[PDB]
From Swiss-Prot, chain A:
Coiled-coil intervals: none
CDD domains cross-referenced by the UniProt entry: EFh
Protein's name according to its UniProt entry: Troponin C, slow skeletal and cardiac muscles
Classification via InterPro entries: CALM/Myosin/TropC-like, EF-hand-dom_pair, EF_Hand_1_Ca_BS, EF_hand_dom
Residue sites binding Ca(2+) 1 per the record: 64, 66, 68, 70, 75
Entry-linked Pfam families: EF-hand_7 (PF13499), EF-hand_8 (PF13833)
Gene that encodes the chain: Tnnc1
UniProtKB/Swiss-Prot annotation, chain B:
Shown stretch of the complete protein: 115 to 171 of 284
Major localization listed first in the record, in broad terms: cytoplasm
Record has Coiled coil as a keyword: yes
Described function: Binds to actin filaments in muscle and non-muscle cells. Plays a central role, in association with the troponin complex, in the calcium dependent regulation of vertebrate striated muscle contraction. Smooth muscle contraction is regulated by interaction with caldesmon. In non-muscle cells is implicated in stabilizing cytoskeleton actin filaments.
Location within or outside the cell: Cytoplasm, Cytoskeleton
Keywords: Acetylation, Actin-binding, Coiled coil, Cytoplasm, Cytoskeleton, Muscle protein, Phosphoprotein
GO biological processes: cardiac muscle contraction; in utero embryonic development; positive regulation of heart rate by epinephrine; ventricular cardiac muscle tissue morphogenesis
Protein name per Swiss-Prot or TrEMBL: Tropomyosin alpha-1 chain
Note in the entry: The sequences of cardiac and skeletal muscles are identical.
Length: 160, 57
């Protein structure tokens, strides 16, 4: 979304040095970015970042959307920066508890994924295929018919 | 005496030239070998992390 565009605008130069080092290491001259996911993972490990093997697998399976290997440095760079950790623990657990206290209009020690749906509906925001289903699926991730407090934590932990 | 000494000195100089060239060859060969070694090391490291994860699970 627009957050990725903003992150592109706020290009952090400290990590930009390492990302352009990756640009140089990969591109051996007029290379149109064939996307060597092996080279991608080797760069990710080399540059000090800690990519999970599943993250590198996703990188392998979410590249070469052109079909010719040549992937625009824009989308590839966005994928690289987002796969890189850019977050501060996603708020505080005390904030989470206080806000869940706010959300417990049912006053039953938790909230409901239906209650969650209605509360976000009160926001007057667009709900789509990206929205709606997985929202309630992962809010009550354990699928108790209601969103427990720890379920509310696990739904959006580490996210700002 | 001086001319004979000149011939022998050039002899020794040329011998050291050739030896140094051979050594440079061996140096570059060991250099590419060392790079290959580092890559093998990193591959083994990744495999190790992976198998550790599996065993924990």
């Amino acid at each position: 979304d627009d957050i990725y565009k903003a992150a592109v605008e706020q290009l952090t130069e400290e990590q930009k040095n390492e990302f352009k080092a990756a640009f140089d290491i990969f591109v051996l001259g007029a290379e149109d970015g064939c996307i060597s996911t092996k080279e991608l993972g080797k760069v990710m490990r080399m540059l000090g970042q800690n990519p999970t093997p599943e993250e590198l697998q996703e990188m392998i399976d979410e590249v070469d959307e052109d079909g010719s290997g040549t992937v625009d440095f824009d989308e590839f760079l966005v994928m690289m920066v987002r796969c890189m950790k850019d977050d501060s623990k996603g708020k505080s657990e005390e904030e989470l508890s206080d806000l869940f206290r706010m959300f417990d209009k049912n006053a039953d020690g938790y909230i409901d994924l239906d209650e969650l749906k209605m509360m976000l509906q009160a926001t007057g925001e667009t709900i789509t295929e990206d929205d709606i289903e997985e929202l309630m699926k992962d809010g009550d991730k354990n699928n108790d018919g209601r969103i427990d407090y720890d379920e509310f934590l696990e739904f959006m932990k580490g996210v700002e | 005496e001086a001319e004979k000494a000149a011939d022998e000195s050039e002899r020794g100089m040329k011998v050291i030239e050739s030896r140094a060239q051979k050594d440079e060859e061996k140096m570059e060969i060991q250099e590419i070998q060392l790079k290959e070694a580092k890559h093998i090391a990193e591959d083994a490291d990744r495999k190790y992390e992976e198998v550790a994860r599996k065993l924990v699970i």
